Ligand binder design. Structure first.
Ligand SMILES: CC1(CS(=O)(=O)N2Cc3ccc(Cl)cc3[C@H](C(=O)Nc3cncc4ccccc34)C2)CS(=O)(=O)C1
Ligand SMILES: CC1(CS(=O)(=O)N2Cc3ccc(Cl)cc3[C@H](C(=O)Nc3cncc4ccccc34)C2)CS(=O)(=O)C1
Ligand SMILES: [Cl-]
Lengths: 298, 305
């Protein structure tokens, strides 16, 4: 029993965190094999003009108490790739993956190449993440683990005026319409991840919370007409198919649970909670619910 | 900016998790130097759990009855002893991944990270608090016994909890690493229930100061209160009494934000009376009590917004 916001064990990622310094800027880098990956703004804009003026010895890379020697450098989109002399002996099995909004991941927040905390979060529909970062956190990474392979999906770059965060995949492509520079940019209006709220309602049923269930069902079209009015993402047939296993386990059809979500949206909770929460939670995917309500290990 | 429920990086603890098997029971163990620590109920059958005599069950065992597995390697058990509700298995190999560590016993209201494991393999990490009734609201399934709670201060891992059992309400009970249970609980399947739970007042206050540091002041008022009048009101909402020690501990956050502890106490009294009125505090519609004053200073900036 119990339902917590759970992150993946961070050990395989901790062994990759390094400190990168260029002049007066200090941020975090990801050391995989003989390459250190970090935000290109560490050189700060015309990034190719700023980069051509730098030499290998201008980049100071520190792994623990050891200084790594930079022997080459190149840029790929908004990420800087620093070739080093030493391959990381702690390099795990890994892949670089680009996630979609609504997907969740673990974040290992670092300052000065040292990991300080781990938390779970989701890529919002507006492509921002509601993270917890201070100055020096740039270059901190987001990841998922599938068996023994770490899938790197996010690298932190900046904070927006509303306190939310923006970053790139590990190939340096931004999530969202953002740019790496000091300019007027704001997060778009955000929406609730409908397939995630539904998965979290199934997790509540699994843990013995059934007060919100009703005898009613709905059509997918009628549900979406209601959901659009509460700034909820449209629910697709793919989402319905993905919720199939949880529907079969609890005996509650996906459209049956949608009628419960419609009633919660029009009437509220009435002084009640679901899994210790007075809000409808949208940062657990259907896979996160199945993984936590089973013993999947790494 | 931002305020998340943050756990400590789990790497130093992952390198200590092992699988312990005794007959038909399989659970987790903590391998530190040449000793593996695990719940003593690994020697029990499900029947035994009603009224087990652990001393009588242990005397009948030999070193080779305990199978210890670290990754794909089998560790050899060369000795065994019992210390309260924990079994200590002496092994023939010291853990090369042993971090700098200490065994600490925490008090209710304190927080810690939990590395949940099944079959000696870590599956997830989460943050939680020791409740006033000495239980923890964890996320554990069968096979999680022996999973540990910890804090990492500087490069040292302070082990404070080892998981032993799930009570009938879904809450969890366990021991410190010296095998002493937190709460009036026993490693017996007897009729035992968690005491009435209460809100950790000093933690809710710390969390209100974290919201002021992040720029939110909608809940503040022009009133103050006496400590006694605050406690008479707080008791009525099942909130823990606030002591002078708690007031002293909140001093740094009070000095940083410019809001006296008893003025923050007045704002809490008002929140309990009125509710939130469709508003949230740090993305939450409930008053949060699983962040200590130390957690807030650690996570939040030193500059108020
Ligand atoms: C104070 C702000 C950030 S900044 O001006 O300090 N900043 C400019 C800048 C521009 C482009 C790029 Cl790619 C990166 C950056 C940097 C940046 O965002 N860093 C930070 C990342 N994460 C958390 C941060 C918490 C506090 C301060 C900096 C944080 C530094 C936040 S705001 O109100 O939108 C402006
Ligand atoms: C299913 C229950 C636990 S048990 O009867 O399987 N159990 C008895 C017992 C007694 C004392 C001691 Cl020290 C240990 C144990 C064991 C125990 O609690 N195991 C477990 C630990 N943590 C999470 C668990 C989630 C599900 C199942 C087992 C879990 C085995 C929970 S309940 O509904 O109140 C009965
Ligand atoms: Cl303590």
């Amino acid at each position: 029993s119990g339902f917590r916001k759970m992150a993946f064990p961070s050990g395989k990622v901790e062994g990759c965190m390094v400190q990168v310094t260029c002049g007066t800027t200090t941020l975090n880098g990801l050391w995989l094999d003989d390459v250190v990956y970090c935000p290109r703004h560490v050189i700060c804009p015309n990034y190719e003009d700023l980069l051509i003026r730098k030499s290998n010895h201008n980049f100071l890379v520190q792994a623990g108490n050891v200084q790594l020697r930079v022997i080459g450098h190149s840029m790929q989109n908004c990420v800087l790739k620093l070739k080093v002399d030493t391959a990381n002996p702690k390099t795990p099995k890994y892949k670089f993956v680009r996630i979609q909004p609504g997907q969740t991941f673990s974040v290992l927040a670092c300052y000065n190449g040292s990991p300080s905390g781990v938390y779970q979060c989701a890529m919002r529909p507006n492509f921002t993440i509601k993270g917890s970062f201070l100055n020096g956190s740039c270059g901190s990474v987001g990841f998922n683990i599938d068996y023994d392979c770490v899938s790197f999906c996010y690298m932190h770059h900046m904070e927006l005026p509303t306190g939310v965060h923006a970053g790139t995949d590990l190939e340096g492509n931004f999530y969202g319409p953002f740019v790496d520079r000091q300019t007027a940019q704001a997060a778009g209006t955000d929406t609730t991840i409908t397939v995630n709220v539904l998965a979290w309602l199934y997790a509540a049923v699994i843990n013995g919370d059934r007060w919100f269930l009703n005898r009613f069902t709905t059509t997918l079209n009628d549900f979406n007409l209601v959901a659009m009015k509460y700034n909820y993402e449209p629910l697709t047939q793919d989402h319905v198919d993905i919720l199939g296993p949880l529907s079969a386990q609890t005996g509650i059809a996906v459209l049956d649970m949608c009628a419960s979500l419609k009633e919660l949206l029009q009437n509220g909770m009435n002084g009640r909670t679901i899994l210790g929460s007075a809000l409808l939670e949208d940062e657990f995917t259907p896979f996160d619910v199945v993984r936590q309500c089973s013993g999947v290990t790494f």
